[PDB]
């Protein structure tokens, strides 16, 4: 079917228009209703995991993991996921005055949700043969900031850790999983992420092959990228479900992400419909080609 990059663009704009999706803010709460409501409008049976999660600083985060289960009676299922919270710190900003102030997270948060929001629209209009679980993970981007010296493990991906050990349905199972992260920036290039190739090799090939078949090899690069801490690591760990990350890899930065990453430059100004189009068209092709 047709992926509407313009609609996925408006869904990103709608989230960011709330203000930053920082856990324990009202903008976060209004956005939680908005995301779950849209999933339900497009035929999903919606599950909201409310969990009080502890950030690196000991703060209790009132998180919502949002699960849209499509055709929930189908036993053969694919997991599509992304994080929806916005980081509380622009801790890589060039202005130190912004280091403890939140980011809009248009690309880091908004893009991966927005694409999956249009997917929900498309699969309500043309039901796929397989079941689809759309999962929006909370409290992914609240990890220890650069301006804190002490290291603690697993302070990122707080929501995906909870769900992976506490699924929304008992014995939840997916054939494989596809994570979308920072999938809207102008000039994005998604290299094959190392954790993905390790545990989801057959599906990295599935996604990268389909992407080139559709003409999106300029986006899905046939080369290896970084080893990345992301939500797909904790779903792999917890369910042993093979998961891949479609995540921007920027080889020119020290961090490996776009220059706006964890800055207040992560706004709608960077979102590229053609980047959105590539990712959305590719995933729609693969899921409808699952039997
Ligand atoms: Zn982030």
Author numbering: 44 to 334
Sentences from the study reporting this entry:
QCs belong to the family of aminoacyltransferases and catalyze the cyclization of N-terminal glutamine/glutamate residues of peptides and proteins with concomitant release of ammonia/water. Glutaminyl cyclases (QCs) from the oral pathogens Porphyromonas gingivalis, Tannerella forsythia, and Prevotella intermedia represent attractive target enzymes for small-molecule inhibitor development, as their action is likely to stabilize essential periplasmic and outer membrane proteins by N-terminal pyroglutamination. Crystal structures of the enzymes from P. gingivalis (PgQC) and T. forsythia (TfQC) reveal a tertiary structure composed of an eight-stranded β-sheet surrounded by seven α-helices, typical of animal type II QCs. In each case, an active site Zn ion is tetrahedrally coordinated by conserved residues.
The same architecture is observed for TfQC, with an r.m.sd to PgQC of 1.1 Å for 286 Cα atoms. The only significant differences are seen in an altered course of the loop between α4 and βD (“4-D loop”, presumably due to the presence of TfPro171) and a lengthened loop connecting βD and α6 (“Tf insertion loop”, which starts with conserved residues PgAsp183 and ends with PgTrp193). A small degree of structural variation is observed between two sets of crystallographically independent TfQC monomers in the loop containing TfGly268-Gly269 that connects βG and α8, which was also observed for mouse QC (MmQC). Interestingly, two distinct conformations of the loop connecting α6 and βE (“6-E loop”) were observed in TfQC: the TfVal212–Pro213 peptide bond adopts a cis-conformation in two of the monomers as opposed to the trans-conformation found in PgQC, leading to an alternative orientation of α6.
